[PDB]
Every structure is written in C-alpha cells, then in structure tokens.
Amino acid sequence: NKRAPYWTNTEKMEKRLHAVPAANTVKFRCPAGGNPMPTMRWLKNGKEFKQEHRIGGYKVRNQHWSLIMESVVPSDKGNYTCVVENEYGSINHTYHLDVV
Amino acid sequence: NKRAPYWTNTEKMEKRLHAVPAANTVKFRCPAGGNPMPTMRWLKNGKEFKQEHRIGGYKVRNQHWSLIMESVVPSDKGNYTCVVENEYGSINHTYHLDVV
C-alpha cells in the first residue's frame, strides 16, 4: 500500500495570499496523507525556517499539518512553503504573508 | 492555481506485481494531474530506462501516462517506476514485472 504524499484537503490551501494586521496570529496548514507517514518542513523565502529566525519563534503542530506564528511583525512578511515528503515523493505549496 | 503532481486514478495503480508470459505486451500507467502539466519519466531498477535498453525499445504515450513494452522477454523482468514532476513536486510509483 505504499504511496507518495498527497494533499488531503485542498480547501484549506486555496487562500495563498494573506494580509494580516501586525500582532495577530497566523496559522498555515498543508493537510497531507501518504504511506509511510510523510514528514513536513517549512521554508521562508526558499530557505529553511528555523526557531531562531523570529523572536517569537514558531509552533509546528504535526497532527494538524500547521505552522503557527503568534504576534506577527513586519519582518515576518514573506513566502512560506510547506515541504511534505516520504521515500515515494516530495511535494510543496507556498503561501504569501503580508503584514498590514 | 499552481499545484504539485498527484495521481488521478489510483485504481489503475493498485496492481503492483505483474507476472506475464514471454512474448506478451505489458502496459504500465501512472495517471497524473498537476499545474503546470507534469512531465513523466520511467526508471527500470532505479536507473533511467532508455530505448536502447531492450531490443524492442519502448513506447511512451504521454496522453495516457503509460509505458508500453511489446513482446516481453525474460531480461525485461524488474522494477519499473514512473517519476512524475513539476516545480511543485516529484512523486513516484513502482511496478514489478515478472516474465513467466
């Protein structure tokens, strides 16, 4: 039953550009399936996004396939991409964050 | 509307192991979708499978996402994998061919 990653709910993913006021919380999701369970990682502007990249750091909820950034600030604007992978494939989606 | 490759009809793909008498024709398919249109390539035992690898050569029908090998011979046994890709992702599936 092995199978490459696939998005399980594209509805959540249709809204690509997000404009949010500073200090609000943004949450990005890339619901996925696959056998074996794929892993997920996030890039910000094409480069690995790490905890130390912003003051507030960030939360990853694997069960919900989401990236959460609390109290956004202007320097958080950018492109956020979820890369999901397993031995049979690697797929990605990109969101754009604009901080109003 | 950009989107990574995805299989559009997994039904065709459920039968992974194929045992076929010599001299018969085998056809493998990996129906796929994605935006932009993904490309497809085939590997035989993990390595690029080229026309010169077998006497009969092989047919690729892009419209139907299939690899066709006429008059199979014992040396054709092996693992056949369709790799489908576009800028948003790369996915693969593997079939096993046994020549009876």
Swiss-Prot record, chains A, B:
* Positions annotated with a glycan in the UniProt record: N79, N92
Domain of life where this protein originates? Eukaryota
Annotated phenotype, changing R54C: In breast cancer samples; infiltrating ductal carcinoma; somatic mutation
Outline the extent of the Ig-like C2-type domain: 5-98
Explain what the record says happens when changing A23F: In PS; requires 2 nucleotide substitutions
Show the disulfide pairing.
C30-C82
Annotated region Heparin-binding: where? Answer: 12-29
Where it sits in the cell: the answer is: Cell membrane; Golgi apparatus; Cytoplasmic vesicle
Q: How is it modified after translation?
A: Autophosphorylated. Binding of FGF family members together with heparan sulfate proteoglycan or heparin promotes receptor dimerization and autophosphorylation on several tyrosine residues. Autophosphorylation occurs in trans between the two FGFR molecules present in the dimer. N-glycosylated in the endoplasmic reticulum. The N-glycan chains undergo further maturation to an Endo H-resistant form in the Golgi apparatus.
Family note: Belongs to the protein kinase superfamily. Tyr protein kinase family. Fibroblast growth factor receptor subfamily.
Comment, domains: The second and third Ig-like domains directly interact with fibroblast growth factors (FGF) and heparan sulfate proteoglycans. Alternative splicing events affecting the third Ig-like domain are crucial for ligand selectivity.
Assembly, in brief, is: Monomer. Homodimer after ligand binding. Interacts predominantly with FGF1 and FGF2, but can also interact with FGF3, FGF4, FGF6, FGF7, FGF8, FGF9, FGF10, FGF17, FGF18 and FGF22 (in vitro). Ligand specificity is determined by tissue-specific expression of isoforms, and differences in the third Ig-like domain are crucial for ligand specificity. Isoform 1 has high affinity for FGF1 and FGF2, but low affinity for FGF7. Isoform 3 has high affinity for FGF1 and FGF7, and has much higher affinity for FGF7 than isoform 1 (in vitro).
Instruction: Please tell me the disease that this Swiss-Prot or TrEMBL record associates with the protein.
Output: Crouzon syndrome: An autosomal dominant syndrome characterized by craniosynostosis, hypertelorism, exophthalmos and external strabismus, parrot-beaked nose, short upper lip, hypoplastic maxilla, and a relative mandibular prognathism.
- Explain the purpose of this protein: Tyrosine-protein kinase that acts as a cell-surface receptor for fibroblast growth factors and plays an essential role in the regulation of cell proliferation, differentiation, migration and apoptosis, and in the regulation of embryonic development. Required for normal embryonic patterning, trophoblast function, limb bud development, lung morphogenesis, osteogenesis and skin development. Plays an essential role in the regulation of osteoblast differentiation, proliferation and apoptosis, and is required for normal skeleton development.
The name this protein carries in UniProt is Fibroblast growth factor receptor 2
What organism is the protein native to? Homo sapiens (Human)
